[PDB]
Design a protein around this ligand. Structure first.
Ligand SMILES: CCCCCCCCCCCCCCCCCC(=O)OC[C@H](COP(=O)([O-])OCC(O)COP(=O)([O-])OC[C@@H](COC(=O)CCCCCCCCCCCCCCCCC)OC(=O)CCCCCCCCCCCCCCCCC)OC(=O)CCCCCCCCCCCCCCCCC
Ligand SMILES: CCCCCCCCCCCCCCCCCC(=O)OC[C@H](COP(=O)([O-])OCC(O)COP(=O)([O-])OC[C@@H](COC(=O)CCCCCCCCCCCCCCCCC)OC(=O)CCCCCCCCCCCCCCCCC)OC(=O)CCCCCCCCCCCCCCCCC
Ligand SMILES: CCCCCCCCCCCCCCCCCC(=O)OC[C@H](COP(=O)([O-])OCC(O)COP(=O)([O-])OC[C@@H](COC(=O)CCCCCCCCCCCCCCCCC)OC(=O)CCCCCCCCCCCCCCCCC)OC(=O)CCCCCCCCCCCCCCCCC
Ligand SMILES: CCCCCCCCCCCCCCCCCC(=O)OC[C@H](COP(=O)([O-])OCC(O)COP(=O)([O-])OC[C@@H](COC(=O)CCCCCCCCCCCCCCCCC)OC(=O)CCCCCCCCCCCCCCCCC)OC(=O)CCCCCCCCCCCCCCCCC
Ligand SMILES: CCCCCCCCCCCCCCCCC[C@@H](O)O[C@H](CO[C@H](O)CCCCCCCCCCCCCCC)COP(=O)(O)OCC[N+](C)(C)C
Ligand SMILES: CCCCCCCCCCCCCCCCC[C@@H](O)O[C@H](CO[C@H](O)CCCCCCCCCCCCCCC)COP(=O)(O)OCC[N+](C)(C)C
Ligand SMILES: CCCCCCCCCCCCCCCCC[C@@H](O)O[C@H](CO[C@H](O)CCCCCCCCCCCCCCC)COP(=O)(O)OCC[N+](C)(C)C
Ligand SMILES: CCCCCCCCCCCC(=O)SCCNC(=O)CCNC(=O)[C@H](O)C(C)(C)COP(=O)(O)O
Lengths: 347, 175, 140, 88, 49, 54, 122, 98, 115
């Protein structure tokens, strides 16, 4: 792929997302989704191999079905009220269709099956883009129509997402599938609090995006895609493994790290609405994500796995390409808990 | 009640959808989609959408020619399937036919809300407007307003078309 | 739908044990049917008849669990003259757990199901009494 | 999981099943130790056909130099066991 | 010592160093003046001084 | 004496295609080191045509 | 679910309305600003460590830029957060004032006339 | 609602069901996607014509445009899939698991 | 109403011609007469085998270029608007983007058939 072509494709993806963000008309939001998918399919296939082709095909099928359901919901809403503005849907059937379509776009359970496969089939850069930037548009649409959310369906999908993310992550040795299941669980956390406080949803999205960017950049810097490949990093760059262990602890929600701030806030917000059982179950379930993060930390930085002889050669060479935003991303992923009240700036 | 021409057309539309959704060989699926496109063009013509119906018919004819070529290239088998050569295909076709029959019967014999809402039928002619004025067609004016009102739509559509050309070229490169 | 749960909850706790058992059996059968549908969709049974058998065993297990729980809880409530008591729900839940263990023919499964299902049923009864909400409305 | 751990007994049963399906062999005068040319009175081409049936049954090709040595059901059993790495 | 070009030579890139230092200095001066103006506006609006 | 550190046998627990190996996933194979599978010998047949005699 | 985004008279993308100038600006020695500078310094140290440079002394201009950028952004973030909390308090007080029937004042009794139950510890 | 509206909505439901239940060929699923788009076009056109929403008359055309893009996208992917396997059967797309 | 009658008449006439052609003459059908034609000989393979498309990329591009026709057909009515400058700008911009798409595919060897 030409660098100019790749830049144009990335700009088209971002401009489709922004068109979704800035539109007041349902047709323009649908157009933004369509443009985003059209430009995003080639990016998944930059490095050509059968696995990338399969991931692109699965992604296209899922997103096209979601787009068709999205348009059907829009058309039913127009039928029952001659309105195109994205304010609040006037038909419960259209609302159910829209909720299911946006859940399929986000990958919430039980529409989660494509996320680990597509993440495993693409490179780490494509995985970073897919798991960070692709969540903005459906979440923005869901935030705009939050007052029309049926709480039962949304909360059921969120709880299923948390549970399934934990259970699926428990079984993985590939790092991309671990990241995908973490994404599913975090998306469940994001959508659990949506019918109550969209500011908490935005804060959770920001924290998750920062930690995911740090994780994927640390995985690109130490070019590992499996657990055993990552077990070799300590013998070449120990600082990377130490920072990765701290970031993994933050992703587990352990205080006083940054990852604790969203869940905490979400929990307290839910208790303001006499929701007690569900936050308790969600936290006890996120314990599973913490468990497999700790397993990765055990294999990567807290113990020293055996290495190979050829590693000596790698001792003689540095990294020619540096990621400029990795240190800031790590610091934001760990030490921003004392700045918690700043969330008032988000509303 | 008046000859229910629109109802017959919509029934044939649903039948063609059942035909290509039971998924026989893509030759017959394309045939069913062509039939559905022509009949939907007829429906829209009956409701006053001459340009939109003709355009959708033309667009789907071109797309189905491309689909036929691609089916002969990469979607063929030794014995292509018809709606009666397979237990699964015939079962799906029959199930769709009787499902449409049941929906129609529960619609025109009594008032019942299947999924979204309920109604009695009575033919489309009731809900018209009897608007009596004009030396033009409102559909043509609304479509032509795209170049004066819909500048933003034209911009985004043209950008998406150019990007789609670039995208197909990028995808089919291989290597 | 929630109409099945409303049909179960409309009957008073210690009255009309047959109707309450029938309602709980209906709820269990629906749950088992949904479980069978997902199992067939994600784990194909290699033949139509084996899929039918899997659906039958799943649905009968779930319906038997529901029937046993409802009957036992209603009978315990009416015999003890203690409605609005989580003990009856605990007894019914353990009866359903023993039913599941006998179905799977496992002693450990039976004991664990008794304990956990009884705890869950007692918790549900407590939530019914004190008005605990699972899906809270957005009050603030 | 894949096919169960094929044993010597199942291999021997399959070999005799496809050997008794051959029309030029008396179904009861055949034994595991019977020599094709001597006891069964077969020719070289009959032996080649038997090896073709063996290849069809056990799903793997047999070269000519080896097939010239398989001269009774027991030799076929030993060859199949060696090729499939079966100890029992 | 080294046998290769060693892009970092005995001298540092004075252009980049100057740009970085100038950016920091300008940001600090801008912050100082903005805080001064904010204090003055707050006092004028609330009638303190 | 020295601190215990993982060895090869300890390391191979994390080298399979999946944690918790069952009988169904025992035949699963880890993906290739680069994300490139070997090409399949799916030879595309040409079309054979009789041109003439008539 | 969206409390303050629909407030009347809200300019879409300002980040700092004019009325926020009526509030006292945060002091430049604000402990939150000092923590922001500390975060910038930590980012600079991690930048040195990742690039395999002397952690404490490698690029002094880079650490200075890190700290300055973090402090610069943190000042305006603190201003916006303070303004939002002030807006919340203003709206709450106005709503309480405009609805006296929902926030009644009831006379408070002294503990000598309120009967509290005693639970012995034994 | 007229019975024509119910027929069009049922057509969309049938096309969605046909897409969600896969046989071997991917081309059939692509055709189901196209049928879904056609039913959406018909439904929106009927609503806009009945309500005499003049400026919305250009809405269905835009729909068609993006339909084409989607169609093209699908066909592109199909080509590559065939090039890998000599077939468009969806059971060959199983290198990745959950 | 008239167009429906015309279509029915034309289809009826064609079907009646087919019926006459199939029921009037004397038919003698045997296996050699009805065999497939390959100029003297039995075909080696099936005619249902895959048949490679060397112009597949142009076929896909035809799909995208067919919708520019939909976008450009309302131009005679669009020419009657009061703000002719905006309409002319948008029409010229759309045609320019179409020409740019054609040029991009041409220069990237996208119009050359596969070998
Ligand atoms: C008041 C409500 C009452 C209760 C309802 C709510 C509680 C739900 C309880 C159901 C628990 C489900 C999981 C349990 C075990 C899993 C199933 C299984 O296969 O084990 C077989 C197991 C036997 O072991 P095995 O056959 O050897 O296992 C084979 C393999 O070793 C291993 O097995 P396998 O490999 O063959 O697995 C099968 C296959 C398939 O696995 C499944 O079966 C999936 C099950 C999910 C269905 C959830 C049921 C909830 C129903 C909701 C509506 C209820 C209405 C009422 O696995 C998968 O492919 C992956 C599964 C997970 C991946 C993602 C799935 C998510 C899909 C969506 C989930 C739910 C969506 C709901 C709506 C969503 C809309 C937003 O047990 C059984 O014999 C089946 C019976 C299960 C007992 C059900 C108990 C119900 C009791 C109800 C009594 C009511 C009392 C009166 C009330 C008053
Ligand atoms: C607006 C939004 C709404 C949208 C939705 C609206 C949809 C409307 C459109 C409806 C019109 C139809 C359109 C045509 C679509 C194209 C279909 C197609 O191409 O099939 C390809 C598909 C695969 O193609 P293939 O590769 O050629 O087939 C190879 C073999 O099939 C496979 O090889 P094998 O033989 O080796 O495999 C073993 C065997 C395995 O087969 C089995 O094991 C299935 C047998 C289960 C029997 C169930 C027990 C009976 C009792 C339950 C009744 C409940 C009440 C009981 C109350 C208490 C009882 C005392 O076959 C299977 O694996 C098939 C499994 C899938 C079964 C059907 C899927 C349904 C959901 C899955 C759950 C299954 C039922 C569980 C119970 C759920 C609750 C009823 O073919 C099929 O699998 C089924 C044949 C197609 C005919 C069925 C289509 C009708 C269903 C339409 C949707 C449901 C109703 C719609 C609305 C109604 C209410 C609103
Ligand atoms: C914090 C500090 C420390 C606290 C924590 C630590 C201490 C507490 C926890 C540790 C101990 C508790 C663990 C529970 C036992 C788990 C058993 C197990 O895992 O089975 C798997 C295990 C493997 O399953 P499998 O591989 O599928 O089957 C192969 C079998 O090995 C093949 O087996 P088999 O063919 O040879 O024969 C099996 C068969 C026949 O087995 C036999 O031959 C022996 C018969 C055993 C049945 C009961 C014992 C009879 C003799 C004493 C009778 C009671 C004396 C007085 C009790 C009241 C005291 C006033 O079993 C039966 O038929 C059972 C029928 C049930 C009738 C009685 C049920 C009464 C349950 C509770 C009674 C007491 C309530 C508590 C009162 C406390 C007073 C303050 O099955 C067994 O081998 C054991 C099965 C026998 C069950 C013994 C349970 C009695 C102990 C009391 C349990 C109640 C406490 C737990 C509360 C929740 C209960 C639902
Ligand atoms: C709560 C209140 C506030 C608390 C503050 C927050 C916590 C501390 C600050 C955190 C961030 C700051 C430092 C992080 C970047 C440093 C990078 C680094 O690697 O350090 C190496 C570096 C030494 O390397 P070198 O000099 O270039 O030469 C040695 C070679 O490089 C040879 O080195 P090597 O790379 O070849 O050695 C290999 C080694 C390399 O591995 C490492 O070096 C580990 C680095 C981990 C990065 C920390 C994560 C990012 C920050 C998150 C902190 C979380 C805190 C929450 C609690 C959880 C604790 C984990 O790998 C291993 O040995 C494997 C160990 C695995 C065991 C698991 C533990 C690892 C994570 C533990 C992190 C603990 C927190 C940070 C504590 C400070 C660490 C320097 O350490 C330093 O010199 C920096 C320390 C600070 C000095 C500046 C202080 C200012 C000067 C004094 C002025 C007084 C100020 C007040 C004025 C008053 C007027 C008088
Ligand atoms: C903020 C940074 C700016 C540059 C980057 C912006 C990125 C987005 C792309 C372009 C922005 C779109 C703005 C144009 C919106 C159109 C509406 C506005 O401009 O008015 C039009 C004015 O017409 C202008 O000529 C618009 C045409 C300008 C755009 C054409 C070329 C620019 C396209 C560049 C990006 C597109 C993709 C890449 C192409 C190479 C029509 O108004 P008018 O007709 O008076 O009255 C209509 C009301 N009536 C009906 C009641 C009478
Ligand atoms: C990891 C911690 C989070 C880091 C977040 C990224 C930090 C860098 C971002 C770069 C700063 C520029 C962002 C915006 C500046 C100007 C844009 C401004 O106009 O936007 C306003 C909005 O202001 C911004 O949203 C504020 C961004 C501040 C984010 C930081 C808060 C993080 C919470 C606490 C964590 C501590 C962070 C420490 C920082 C180093 C418009 O408001 P409005 O259009 O009406 O709201 C739209 C959404 N509504 C309607 C649904 C409500
Ligand atoms: C240009 C457009 C306008 C055209 C208008 C005319 C349209 C004509 C359509 C087709 C007719 C042309 C065919 C020529 C005569 C028809 C003969 C055939 O169709 O029927 C025969 C009739 O055969 C029937 O199977 C047996 C007759 C019994 C069935 C008739 C049912 C009712 C009759 C009961 C007797 C009581 C009278 C009731 C009526 C008043 C079958 O002959 P068959 O050998 O196969 O086919 C070869 C025909 N050959 C010999 C001419 C080459
Ligand atoms: C469908 C219609 C098909 C009909 C057409 C068939 C056309 C094919 C014709 C092919 C003719 C040939 O190849 S001609 C075959 C080539 N020549 C020979 O085979 C003779 C020399 N071989 C011997 O003498 C051996 O000793 C021997 C007697 C075999 C003892 O075999 P055993 O070691 O076992 O004992």
């Amino acid at each position: 792929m030409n660098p100019i072509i790749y830049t144009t494709l990335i700009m088209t993806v971002m401009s489709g997302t922004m068109l979704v963000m800035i539109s007041s008309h349902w047709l323009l939001i649908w157009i933004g989704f369509e443009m985003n998918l059209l430009a995003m399919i080639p990016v998944l296939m930059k490095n050509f191999n059968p696995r990338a082709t399969e991931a692109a095909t699965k992604y296209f099928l899922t997103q096209a079905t979601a787009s068709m359901m999205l348009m059907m919901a829009i058309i039913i809403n127009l039928l029952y009220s001659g309105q195109w503005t994205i304010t609040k849907m006037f038909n419960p059937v259209a609302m159910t269709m829209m909720t299911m379509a946006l859940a399929m776009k986000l990958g919430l359970s039980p529409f989660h099956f494509w996320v680990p496969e597509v993440t495993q089939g693409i490179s780490l850069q494509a995985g970073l883009l897919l798991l960070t930037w692709q969540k903005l548009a459906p979440l923005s649409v869901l935030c705009q129509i939050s007052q029309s959310i049926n709480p039962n369906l949304m909360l059921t999908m969120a709880m299923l997402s948390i549970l399934i993310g934990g259970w699926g992550g428990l079984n993985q040795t590939q790092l991309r599938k671990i990241m995908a299941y973490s994404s599913i669980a975090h998306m469940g956390w994001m959508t659990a609090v949506l019918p109550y406080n969209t500011t908490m949803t935005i804060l959770n999205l920001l924290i998750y995006i920062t930690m995911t960017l740090a994780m994927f950049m640390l995985l690109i810097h130490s070019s590992a895609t499996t657990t055993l490949s990552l077990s070799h990093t300590w013998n070449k760059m120990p600082v990377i493994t130490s920072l990765m262990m701290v970031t993994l602890l933050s992703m587990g929600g352990l205080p006083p790290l940054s990852g604790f701030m969203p869940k905490w806030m979400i929990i307290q917000e839910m208790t303001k609405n006499e929701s007690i059982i569900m936050p308790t179950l969600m936290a006890m379930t996120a314990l599973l994500n913490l468990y497999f993060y700790m397993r990765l930390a055990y294999s990567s930085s807290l113990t020293m796995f055996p290495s190979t002889n050829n590693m000596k050669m790698k001792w003689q060479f540095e990294h020619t390409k540096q990621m400029k935003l990795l240190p800031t991303m790590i610091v934001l992923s760990t030490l921003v808990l004392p700045m918690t009240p700043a969330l008032s700036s988000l509303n | 009640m008046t000859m229910y021409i629109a109802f017959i057309l919509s029934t044939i539309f649903v039948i063609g959808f059942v035909g290509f959704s039971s998924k026989p060989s893509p030759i017959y699926g394309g045939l069913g989609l062509i039939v559905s496109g022509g009949v939907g063009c007829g429906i829209v013509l009956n409701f006053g959408g001459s340009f939109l119906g003709l355009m959708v018919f033309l667009i789907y004819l071109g797309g189905m020619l491309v689909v036929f070529g691609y089916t002969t290239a990469m979607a063929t088998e030794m014995y292509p399937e018809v709606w009666v050569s397979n237990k699964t295909v015939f079962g799906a076709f029959v199930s769709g036919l009787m499902m449409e029959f049941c929906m129609v019967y529960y619609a025109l014999k009594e008032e019942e809300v299947e999924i979204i809402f309920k109604f009695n039928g009575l033919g489309d002619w009731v809900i018209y407007d009897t608007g009596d004025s004009g030396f033009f067609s409102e559909e043509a004016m609304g479509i032509a307003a795209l170049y004066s009102y819909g500048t933003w739509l034209v911009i985004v559509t043209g950008w998406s078309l150019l990007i789609g050309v670039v995208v197909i070229m990028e995808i089919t490169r291989g290597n | 739908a929630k109409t099945l749960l409303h049909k179960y909850s409309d009957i008073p706790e210690g009255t009309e044990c047959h109707r309450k058992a029938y309602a709980s059996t209906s709820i269990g059968g629906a749950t088992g049917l949904i479980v069978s549908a997902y199992s067939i969709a994600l784990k194909p049974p290699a033949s139509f008849l084996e899929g039918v058998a899997r659906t039958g065993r799943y649905t009968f297990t779930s319906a038997a669990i529901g029937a046993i729980f409802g009957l036992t809880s209603c009978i315990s409530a009416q015999v003890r003259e203690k409605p609005d008591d989580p003990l009856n729900y605990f007894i019914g839940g353990c009866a359903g757990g023993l039913t599941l263990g006998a179905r799977t023919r496992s002693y450990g499964i039976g004991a664990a199901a008794c304990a956990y299902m009884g705890l869950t049923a007692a918790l549900v009864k407590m939530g019914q009494l004190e008005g605990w909400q699972v899906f809270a409305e957005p009050k603030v | 999981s894949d096919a169960p751990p094929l044993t010597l007994e199942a291999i021997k049963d399959r070999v005799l099943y496809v050997l008794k399906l051959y029309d030029k062999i008396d179904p009861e005068k055949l034994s595991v130790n019977s020599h094709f040319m001597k006891d069964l009175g077969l020719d070289s081409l009959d032996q080649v056909e038997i090896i073709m049936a063996m290849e069809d049954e056990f799903g793997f090709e047999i070269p000519d130099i080896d097939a010239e040595k398989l001269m009774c059901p027991q030799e076929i059993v030993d060859y199949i066991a060696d090729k499939k790495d079966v100890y029992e | 010592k080294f046998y290769i070009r060693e892009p970092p030579h005995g001298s540092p890139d004075w252009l980049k160093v100057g740009l970085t230092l100038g950016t920091s200095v300008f940001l600090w001066i801008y912050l100082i003046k903005q805080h001064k103006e904010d204090v003055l506006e707050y006092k004028r609006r609330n009638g303190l001084e | 004496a020295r601190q215990w550190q993982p060895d090869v046998e300890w390391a191979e627990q994390f080298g399979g295609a999946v944690m918790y190996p069952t009988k169904e996933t025992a035949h699963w194979k880890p993906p290739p080191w680069n994300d490139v599978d070997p090409p399949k010998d799916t030879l595309v047949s040409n079309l054979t045509l009789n041109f003439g005699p008539q | 679910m969206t409390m303050m985004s629909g407030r009347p008279g809200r300019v879409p993308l300002q980040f700092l309305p004019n009325e926020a100038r009526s509030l006292p600006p945060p002091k430049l020695t604000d402990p939150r600003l000092v923590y922001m500078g500390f975060l910038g310094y930590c980012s600079g140290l991690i930048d040195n460590a990742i690039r395999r440079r002397p952690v404490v002394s490698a690029g002094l201009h880079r650490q200075l830029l890190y700290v300055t950028s973090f402090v610069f952004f943190g000042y305006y973030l603190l201003k916006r957060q303070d303004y939002m909390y002030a807006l919340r308090d203003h709206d709450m007080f106005a709503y309480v004032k405009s609805h006296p029937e929902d926030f009644p004042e009831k006379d408070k009794k002294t503990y000598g006339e309120i009967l509290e139950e005693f639970h012995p510890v034994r | 609602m007229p019975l024509v509206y119910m027929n069009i909505i049922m057509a969309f439901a049938i096309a969605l069901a046909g897409l969600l239940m896969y046989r071997s060929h991917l081309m059939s699923s692509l055709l189901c996607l196209e049928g879904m788009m056609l039913s959406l076009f018909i439904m929106s056109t009927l609503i806009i014509l009945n309500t005499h929403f003049t400026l919305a008359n250009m809405m269905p055309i835009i729909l068609l445009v993006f339909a084409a893009c989607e169609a093209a996208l699908g066909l592109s992917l199909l080509v590559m899939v065939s090039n890998t396997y000599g077939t468009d059967y969806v059971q060959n797309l199983n290198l990745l698991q959950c | 109403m008239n167009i429906m009658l015309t279509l029915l008449t034309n289809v009826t006439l064609a079907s009646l011609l087919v019926l006459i052609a199939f029921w009037l003459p004397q038919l003698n059908a045997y296996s050699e007469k009805t065999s497939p034609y390959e100029c003297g000989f039995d075909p080696m393979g099936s005619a249902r085998l895959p048949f490679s498309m060397k112009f597949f990329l142009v076929a896909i591009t035809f799909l995208l270029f067919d919708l520019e026709i939909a976008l450009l057909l309302p131009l005679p009515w669009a020419s009657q608007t009061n703000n002719l400058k905006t309409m002319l700008t948008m029409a010229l911009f759309l045609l320019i983007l179409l020409a740019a798409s054609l040029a991009y595919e041409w220069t990237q060897k996208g119009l050359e058939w596969a070998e």
